[PDB]
Amino acid sequence: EIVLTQSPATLSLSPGERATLSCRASQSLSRNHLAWYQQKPGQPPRLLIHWASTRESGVPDRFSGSGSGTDFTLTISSLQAEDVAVYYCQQHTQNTWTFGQGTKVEIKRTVAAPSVFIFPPSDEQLKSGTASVVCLLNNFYPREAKVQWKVDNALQSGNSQESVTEQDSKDSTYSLSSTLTLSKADYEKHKVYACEVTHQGLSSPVTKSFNRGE
Amino acid sequence: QLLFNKTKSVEFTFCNDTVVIPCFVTNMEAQNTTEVYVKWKFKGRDIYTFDGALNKSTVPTDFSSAKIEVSQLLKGDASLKMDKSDAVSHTGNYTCEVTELTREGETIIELKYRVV
Amino acid sequence: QVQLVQSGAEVKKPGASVKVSCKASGYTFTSYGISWVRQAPGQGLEWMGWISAYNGNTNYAQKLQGRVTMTTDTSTSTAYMELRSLRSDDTAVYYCARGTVYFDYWGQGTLVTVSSASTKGPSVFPLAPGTAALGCLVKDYFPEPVTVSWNSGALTSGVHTFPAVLQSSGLYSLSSVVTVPSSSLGTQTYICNVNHKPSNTKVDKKA
Ligand SMILES: [Zn+2]
Ligand SMILES: [Zn+2]
Ligand SMILES: [Zn+2]
Ligand SMILES: [Zn+2]
Ligand SMILES: [Zn+2]
User: What φ, ψ does residue C140 adopt, rounded to 5°?
Assistant: First the structure.
């Protein structure tokens, strides 16, 4: 049972630069038994290279594979904004098939601070008995960003969920949503609803808040 | 997947100037030699590999004479050819692994040594 | 012209069974193998099994514990994957592929969601406000997917429809937002079009 360890887990390279993706094999492999796959978000995997070096028809020459034995490499010479994907190596040896964990290739850009917005619950959702407060973080890079909810200046824990878009094709930025969920009775019990955002492009955390009833 | 005209054993003596190990794929479909990959195994070690996409042969030190006839590959002939010096020291079961892009197949043939 | 068209997405309860079909065209079906690979949402590819389109011989992933049966129909050039005793672990996108050593052609995938939740339509609520932001909150729906369009596709710049998140009630919820000039608040009217096909839901809401 071959195990394919793939390094690194995540890669952030600027456009035009050279990416080196590794695929270790727990046992020796013949060159015809290693293949590389590209998968963009929401699309089926696309085969790039077979026999560890032979790209498919239509695959650009920027993708080249090499290696033998237990070490194989996929190299992207001039990284493009259309190459943002997860790259998988696959082996087949004597009635065994395995996949590597994959490497997510990311496009690097200049640091951009997020624009933070906050949304009170609709008077109409409160009829259903629950309140949803939404905090929006728009067009920021890098992805790492900490969003914290404070209700009556009390740090919240365990009642908010995050979701993040894929990297934008145009400006290579990210956008994030954070939603705080409360019961109707608990929501009406409090006044100040704040969303504190920490990001590398922000010298100090940014707080967007509202008073319940405005 | 690939099918074969299986031969269990072939044997050689001193008289054989060169020794050939047959390998015949009966259902190959490749229109070009770039789609075929050939590998021979002896004891768990790759002896001869022919990457048709690269037109490259790879043999170890003790199998330098080993090669196949590329001109005959598109007809399914993946037979291994080696000098008898390399044959006598390495006698046993040989595996002929033929790869046609995504398709594959292998067969086991024992090379036997006789004496008169 | 080599194609692998897969059957539509399915929703199943724990313990039930699912069968996914893989209709092949553009090549001699019985001359190749067929492999199955699945992928849980947000995780890596997981090889499931391989089947000979000529023979019917199969090799199954050991961790599937004989819960999977793969068959072919050479009359219709169709491959089938049946997984029984479904559990929440099996919620994934299922793929069929042509090759044996590697896989050079893939189906479009089939989403199989395994949960005890029941199919439900979404509730859409408004998210009201130099630059001003607004959006729609699509909450408490099952199963996925939901599709959000702004002004019937007229407005696309600045539109961010976030990936759905699975809240602890077993239902899905997501938000779709768009940034617009503050001045255009009065001149233009913004509506969101939410389409939840598995419940025949079509909702348009002002924001
Ligand atoms: Zn082999
Ligand atoms: Zn095999
Ligand atoms: Zn033919
Ligand atoms: Zn030796
Ligand atoms: Zn934006």
Answer: 60, 60
Residue A70 at interface with chain B, using a CB cutoff of 8 Å: no
Give the Cβ contact number of residue C166 at 10 Å.
17
Cβ contact (<8 Å) for A119 and C127?
yes
Q: Do the strands B103-113 and B9-12 form a parallel or antiparallel pair, or are they unpaired? A: parallel
Which helix (H) or strand (E) is B85 found in, with range?
Answer: helix B84-89
Residue of B nearest to C103 (CA): B102
Q: Which CATH class is domain C123-206?
A: mainly beta
For chains B and C, CB pairs below 8 A equal 28
- Going by the DSSP 8-state scheme, the letter that residue B84 receives in this structure is H
Nearest-Cα distance to chain C for B44, in Å, is: 19
CATH of domain A115-211: 2.60.40.10
CA of C100 to the centre of ligand 2 (A): 7
Angle at B47 between CA B46 and CA B52, to 5 degrees: 85
Chains in contact with B via at least 3 Cβ–Cβ pairs below 8 Å: A, C
How many Cα atoms within 13 Å fall on the side-chain side of residue C53?
A: 28
C-alpha B11, offset from chain centre: 15
Give C-chain residues touching B102 at CB under 8 angstroms.
32-33, 98-104
Query: Which residues have their alpha-adjacent CB atom under 5 A from ion ligand 1?
Result: B 97
Q: Which amino acid is at C105?
A: Y
Rounded Cα–Cα distance for residues A116 and A113 (Å) = 9
How far is the C-alpha of C125 from the C-alpha of A121, rounded, in Å?
A: 8
CATH fourth-level superfamily of C3-114: Immunoglobulins (2.60.40.10)
Kindly state the tokens that stand for B77: 């002939």
